[PDB]
Amino acid sequence: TSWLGQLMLLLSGLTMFMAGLGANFEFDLKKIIALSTLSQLGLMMSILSMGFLKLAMFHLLTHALFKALLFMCAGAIIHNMNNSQDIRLMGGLSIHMPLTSACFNVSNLALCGMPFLAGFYSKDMILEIVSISNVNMFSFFLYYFSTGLTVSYSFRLVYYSMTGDLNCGSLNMLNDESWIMLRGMMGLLIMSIIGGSMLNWLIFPFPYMICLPIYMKLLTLFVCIVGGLFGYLISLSNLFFLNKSLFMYNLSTFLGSMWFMPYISTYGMIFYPLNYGQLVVKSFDQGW
Amino acid sequence: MLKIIFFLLFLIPFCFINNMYWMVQIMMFFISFIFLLMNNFMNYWSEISYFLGCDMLSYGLILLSLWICSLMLLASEMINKHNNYKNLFLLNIIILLLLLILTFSSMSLFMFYLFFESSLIPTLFLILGWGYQPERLQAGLYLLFYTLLVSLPMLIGIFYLMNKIGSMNFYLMNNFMFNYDLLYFCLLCAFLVKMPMFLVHLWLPKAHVEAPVSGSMILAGIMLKLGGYGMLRVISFLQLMNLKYSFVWISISLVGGVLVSLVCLRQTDLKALIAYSSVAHMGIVLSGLLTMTYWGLCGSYTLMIAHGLCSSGLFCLANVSYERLGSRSMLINKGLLNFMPSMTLWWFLLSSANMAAPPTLNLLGEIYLLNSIVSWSWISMILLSFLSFFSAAYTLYLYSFSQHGKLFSGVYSFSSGKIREYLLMLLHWLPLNLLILKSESFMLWL
Amino acid sequence: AQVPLAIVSHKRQVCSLYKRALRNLESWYDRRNVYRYRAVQLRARFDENRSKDLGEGIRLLACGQRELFETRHFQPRNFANSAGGCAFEREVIPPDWVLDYWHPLEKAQYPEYFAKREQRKKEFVTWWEKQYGK
Amino acid sequence: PRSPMASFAESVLNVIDGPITWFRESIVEPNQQKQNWYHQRFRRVPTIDQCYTDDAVCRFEADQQFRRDRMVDNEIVNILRQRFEDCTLYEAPDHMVKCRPLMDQYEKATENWFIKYGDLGGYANAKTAYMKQKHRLIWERRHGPVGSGMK
Amino acid sequence: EPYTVPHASTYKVESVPQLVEVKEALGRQGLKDPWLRNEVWRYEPKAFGTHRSRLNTFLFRGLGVGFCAFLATVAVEYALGIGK
Amino acid sequence: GNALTHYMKPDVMPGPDVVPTFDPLLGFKSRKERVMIATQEEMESAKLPLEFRDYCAHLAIAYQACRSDTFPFVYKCAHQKHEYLTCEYEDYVLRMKEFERERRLLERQKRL
Amino acid sequence: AGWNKDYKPGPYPQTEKERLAAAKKYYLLPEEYKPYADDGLGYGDYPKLGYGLGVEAKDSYYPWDYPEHKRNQHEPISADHDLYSEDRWSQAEPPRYSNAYYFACFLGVMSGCLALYYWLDDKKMYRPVAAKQYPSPGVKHYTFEK
Amino acid sequence: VLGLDKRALWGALPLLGFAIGHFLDKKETERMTMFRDKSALYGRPAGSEGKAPSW
Amino acid sequence: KSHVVSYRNGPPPHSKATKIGALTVGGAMWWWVIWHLWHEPDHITGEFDYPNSRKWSNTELGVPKD
Amino acid sequence: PPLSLKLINERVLLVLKLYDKIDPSKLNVESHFINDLGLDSLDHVEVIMAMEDEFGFEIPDSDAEKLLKPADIIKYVADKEDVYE
């Protein structure tokens, strides 16, 4: 009800936008999933600022379901690699890891927004409510642009992991016979297929009504299609292409470092307080 | 109340009989239990005996000392192991405890002062007698001379109050309000020293770093409280004068707390770092105390109890590490999680309490001083945010740096932790939590 | 053993710069087919300078090093199991002397193992005395 | 039990309630003894105004009486807070219309509480509270009610 | 034993069409790749498949069976008079 | 649609969540009235949230009657959900017509 | 083992003969040794070492006596080692850009988008609809059709 | 389970101090009998008073 | 440190359980998605027509005649 | 799993044989790179890079100067993996 709604919407929008781009440059499997988590948190914070509780709560539970599954998949993948999170080493896991890759595919699609998975029921209704209410022009663009970005990096990760040709080391422990790890995963996997629809009939004693023109209701799917193609297609390469990330070196370093936030918060700040400790003790506790 | 005093007096001869070191603590622990049963106190004084009473304020501080002074004997088992004048050592604590019990149980202001400082000399013997490093001299004087220099002028301020009130008894004093500027400085600059205030704390890092483990306990455990306890009794009739100069003390302690926290981050000595952590929290205690509000007073009483148990607790752990690694520097002490993993648990809980972590009694008191200070002036939110932030910055550095990393290379083989050490740590922390259940008693002294 | 001497020949500075240059190249072009293509070209640039005077070479390294640093990747690859890697020395193993402080009943769970260690202790002293002159 | 689960819900509530009621009725209640406990009553004592400036027992009498009355008055506010506390939970979503009178009772009590014990801090005693009243009344007749400023 | 080290003679650069694309480029540029026979093992089709096979399998694994189950689901629904 | 037109020619676009500014009976020979179905007691007894206490309440109450009748298997009440949504769709249309009416009228006054 | 009084720094060195003993006293060859400026806050004759990119920039693969500190047996320790330690303000490689550059970009972007968002706060895209007609007493809500 | 021996027999001496300490202050309360059942807040009603004084 | 290791080679064959599981997971997902599209095709497109406000006549809104 | 020494001997030689600027006949455990096999310094760098990827770690540039024959490389990898069998 107050000015804080104005601010939270802006800050949240950047958070979901920034990691959306950051996820398209990071190369650590463990980190890409982390920015993915953070990117969707901004989505809740923004819709939450609109004034809706069930929508935020509904998506929150949905996020926990499949996002936990993704990390479980990553742990199995990494442990079979030589403890390396980098995606540039991995590749071709769709056949070397049948079961784990299948466990990932469902989770990734849930993030993508394939209709009637866990994520779709939450992402859809949220985007629809955004287009129904009185939103900011800048906020609206970030909402839908991030969804394109959300699918972009996700299939970018598909290429570097499953469809991409193998790029590992000479000695590879590729194996998918860890049943003890797998049984726990199928608990989440079942829920990620029914968690969405189940909660729709329970969370909402008064379902939201929506009636929007076709050329916006279909925008959520269309961007997801563009994002999936754009993320996948651009990920490809050849011998005589242009390393666009290298060419715009300054921009890539900016977006690949999360806008220098780690530097700002870890190397641009700690120098000053710690020096002050010396000047005090140097000049008072053993000086004046 | 005399039940306690005469119990202690007749335990003095146990110092002389041989092979009675361990039979002493049990008599010291048992009396705590007996004292723990006689809680029926109120804001006003109760159980009068010739000049000795006890209210809810004095009770908690007395009971804190009996607990702490009992743990001193557990901690300083090395004195028993090497028969290093243990009999004299025991007599020092039994005498010291009696001075504390009288100091808090005294009903008249002159008495409080009489045993206020008199407890110092048993402490001073403790530092010189059983301290390792050569600097216990140059730290023995600081403790004695900062205190005496500011306590002797307080004696004049006490006598000047007879000729106006006609008596010392605390209740009769509260009926008056004095307007003389110097008198204000002759009854608070004497306690502001012992708190300590940031600019007159130069004795605290020296006394604590050099004193033995037991001396560290009582110095950090009860001596810093006698300054705090004294203020709670003498701002009652300095209310008017307190309003003209409080803003000087609040600013110094608040800014003093922040600056010391940075100083903590640049320390490299465990004993030094814990000692400087005492000044940080004691700045909040003093700050809230001088706010004079109901919350700032009850909260300050609470935090003094909690902080003493914790800072006393953290001095146990530094002694444990120092006893084996032989050096108290942070560089030597690394990765102790990989030598003494069972010990590292106690490091965390005592460390966590120091940073106002729940559900400790420390967080209850700190919530309150924070409330009073904020109500005093919304400008206090600036550093009060910084101080609480940095008050965890060094605590993590203290814990993480000493427990986490890869082990030291030059260290020679040493014993692992013993049951005595674990039992000592439990008695420090475990009350610090369960006390939250009955904060009813150790909070509402007003 | 041998402790490396800090002095590094100019020939070695070129060697190291070549190794860093190639490794940086992998990060930009992950794919092996592309990497091998570009890495070959990178080696060509060095052979077109192999026939030059050292003093001229001093000028080459300076711009050769600066351009590398000016083109450093924002997320350079490492090997997870080695110095700087994300998974380097995760575990820490205490010194041997820990074992000797076990409670005697604890030692009874591995009587063979502690039987052997005490035979080794006898050998170790004689080994240590000879090595360091006792 | 029109709902399926609610039909199952009541089944459990029978299982957890059945034994405890039996246990309460079978062992605890039947075996206990009859005994009554009473409620402290305090005879009102002279206020601080009657006390002389030299006697301490009479001041001590009133200071304790003031403190006991403070507790009663501290928490008569607390009870009124709990009423508005409970109405907001027992009347939602339409709770604004019903809690509004309760909050009006609460806010008035706070001001009367703050006019009496307010701004004394710790060490507030019968003498200080009474003397605030004397100064307050003098200002009232001279400058009117507080909040209007001086003349 | 954990594995057996195959012989260098087995790996022939002409097997992998992708690597051979590199050589014709280097010949045009005038260079030669020594470390090319190493890369061959990564692109063995029978054991690693191609880009097309890995993509088809990854996205549509079980789709054929998934559809077949759905037809049974529609069968039961029709036999329960639900679809209409 | 969009809302730049409101920025560039605000004289024509009524604006966000516009409350009607013309006489409701203007331009109408008559326009019939609107009738509640659910009393205050009925709304309160079912704890109907205040933002849902609009004209559709009775259908919403019917939804809770059925939904509570088969909980948790609320899919056995999917039919009832259709009507409540079927109705609240009408209100959105009425709000739409209410908007266009004002937009069309607001244009007329500019012309004259 | 000795004590602190037996190891505290000597007064600032003034002579070459004094410098050489001072360099000896810290196990340094006479060329490394460099006392602090002695403005008045100096550390006496204590050396000045490190102060570079930090400890973590030291060679990791060298066989250090103390790998944990990345230090040798009797080697002295920089007076500010607690600040340039591996976990404190240090980096493995020189930063890509000047320290000023990073702050400008992040804040420059942030401010550049704060203004844009707030400038559009009025121009909210709204669907073409009137307000909820919540039934209020004594108020007249109609339906369009006759 | 206590693990106490004959040395704890000396403990009776400190317990002796407890009883002596208890006795004196108990004797002191018997010296405090001039507001006993006379204060305005607990004073007995004037007339027909209990034989034994409370406390 | 998986007990399986392969040198310059694809991993060994797969047990029956893993082979089946991959299809069951992937197959189960698709079965769910298809069924919802079959039975609820009105959620991807609007379940309610968005009315063309322009199509409305001036009279039905009661627009007075100029 | 344990990396047998015999495998290290096989793994090293496999890489060298695949390297096209070396002789498969001269190539043996004892041969020198720059002396016998006519390897340049830059060529010797590329070989180490293959060794690094072959076994999965960094061979420091300072310590690569001790690796002047495949036996030394075999010894190095054995020392790092402490497989002395």
Side-chain angles (χ1 to χ4, degrees), chain D residues 70-113:
Chain D
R70 195 170 178 280
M71 271 155 207
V72 176
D73 284 21
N74 296 115
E75 61 155 30
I76 286 162
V77 175
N78 193 37
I79 300 306
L80 299 164
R81 201 184 281 105
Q82 282 175 26
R83 291 181 173 179
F84 160 81
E85 201 52 36
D86 199 343
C87 180
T88 306
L89 188 149
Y90 202 88
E91 300 307 330
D94 188 7
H95 62 267
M96 283 73 74
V97 170
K98 269 72 76 179
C99 314
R100 191 223 45 65
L102 289 163
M103 203 60 189
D104 285 6
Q105 261 196 321
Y106 171 84
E107 60 85 6
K108 288 197 180 202
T110 54
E111 193 177 44
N112 291 4
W113 184 92

Side-chain angles (χ1 to χ4, degrees), chain C residues 22-33:
Chain C
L22 288 179
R23 289 298 190 192
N24 184 11
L25 199 72
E26 289 176 354
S27 305
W28 286 117
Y29 315 95
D30 64 325
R31 281 305 195 281
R32 305 291 298 166
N33 56 4

Side-chain angles (χ1 to χ4, degrees), chain B residues 18 132 258 261 274:
Chain B
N18 77 282
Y132 316 96
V258 180
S261 306
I274 293 153

